UniProtKB/Swiss-Prot annotation:
It comes from the Archaea. The keyword Cell membrane applies. This is Bacteriorhodopsin. One of its GO terms (cellular component) is plasma membrane. The record marks D81 as: Primary proton acceptor. It is found in: Cell membrane. The keyword Flavoprotein does not apply. Keywords: Cell membrane, Chromophore, Hydrogen ion transport, Ion transport, Membrane, Photoreceptor protein, Pyrrolidone carboxylic acid, Receptor, Retinal protein, Sensory transduction, Transmembrane, Transmembrane helix, Transport. GO terms for molecular function: light-driven active monoatomic ion transmembrane transporter activity; monoatomic ion channel activity; photoreceptor activity. It is a multi-pass membrane protein. Homotrimer. Coiled coil: none annotated.
């Protein structure tokens, strides 16, 4: 086929792979029980993204959804990636501040709704309703971010400065990157169709890679992961 966005898919596949092996290698040398935990979670994140990026590079995870009088290309493999990578990222953050089980369950549950309605909206055939689903998905995301900013940050204050300061950064990178996803979707292929697919794929790989390998590098190179 040779679609305009393949080069960005090939670049995302590459970055996720390198980041995966590096974390995997760095993670299996570590003996600390707790550090091992964070390593297993942070390595798995780019591993899942890598395979999904690879699948898309190879022509899977794409479907034509009709609406707006057009046959629109929707990369659904993206939601198969995020369904597992986003809750894992939330988990990494919850383990850092010693979040309570109740908080985690609700964060992952909220996360499940976000991706679910997100995909339903990306698949919806009535244009206007695509935004209803989008809206719900976004509201779910703001809830998650609110918890991370008001809840978590508060509990990270019962931690050492080193741990509280590693969280602030990861929390900040997450609030900026996650917010961005909602806007890309809205003005992109799933939404208004203002931004072309090739550029949209570029925006998504930059957010995906920053949010996984970027996040992982910051987290795994810190000593706050030690028990
Ligand atoms: C590695 C992937 C990460 C960190 C992905 C984060 C993805 C989001 C925060 C996605 C959010 C979305 C919305 C707020 C609404 C519309 C649909 C989504 C799923 C693109």
């Amino acid at each position: 086929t040779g679609r305009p966005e393949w080069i960005w898919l090939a670049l995302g596949t590459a970055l996720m792979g390198l980041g995966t092996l590096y974390f995997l290698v760095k993670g299996m040398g570590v003996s600390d029980p707790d550090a091992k935990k964070f390593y297993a979670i942070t390595t798995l994140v780019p591993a899942i993204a890598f395979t999904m990026y690879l699948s898309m590079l190879l022509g899977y995870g794409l479907t034509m959804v009709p609406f707006g009088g057009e046959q629109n290309p929707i990369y659904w493999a993206r939601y198969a990636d995020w369904l597992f990578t986003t809750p894992l990222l939330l988990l990494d953050l919850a383990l850092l501040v010693d979040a309570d089980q109740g908080t985690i369950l609700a964060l992952v549950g909220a996360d499940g709704i976000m991706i679910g309605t997100g995909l339903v909206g990306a698949l919806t055939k009535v244009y206007s309703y695509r935004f209803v689903w989008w809206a719900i998905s976004t509201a779910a995301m703001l809830y998650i971010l609110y918890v991370l900013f008001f809840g978590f940050t508060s509990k990270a204050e019962s931690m050492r400065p080193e741990v509280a300061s590693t969280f602030k950064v990861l929390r900040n990178v997450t609030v900026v990157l996650w917010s961005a996803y909602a806007v890309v979707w809205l003005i992109g292929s799933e939404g208004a169709g203002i931004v072309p697919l090739n550029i949209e794929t570029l925006l998504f790989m930059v957010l995906d890679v920053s949010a996984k390998v970027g996040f992982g590098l910051i987290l795994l190179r810190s000593r706050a992961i030690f028990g």
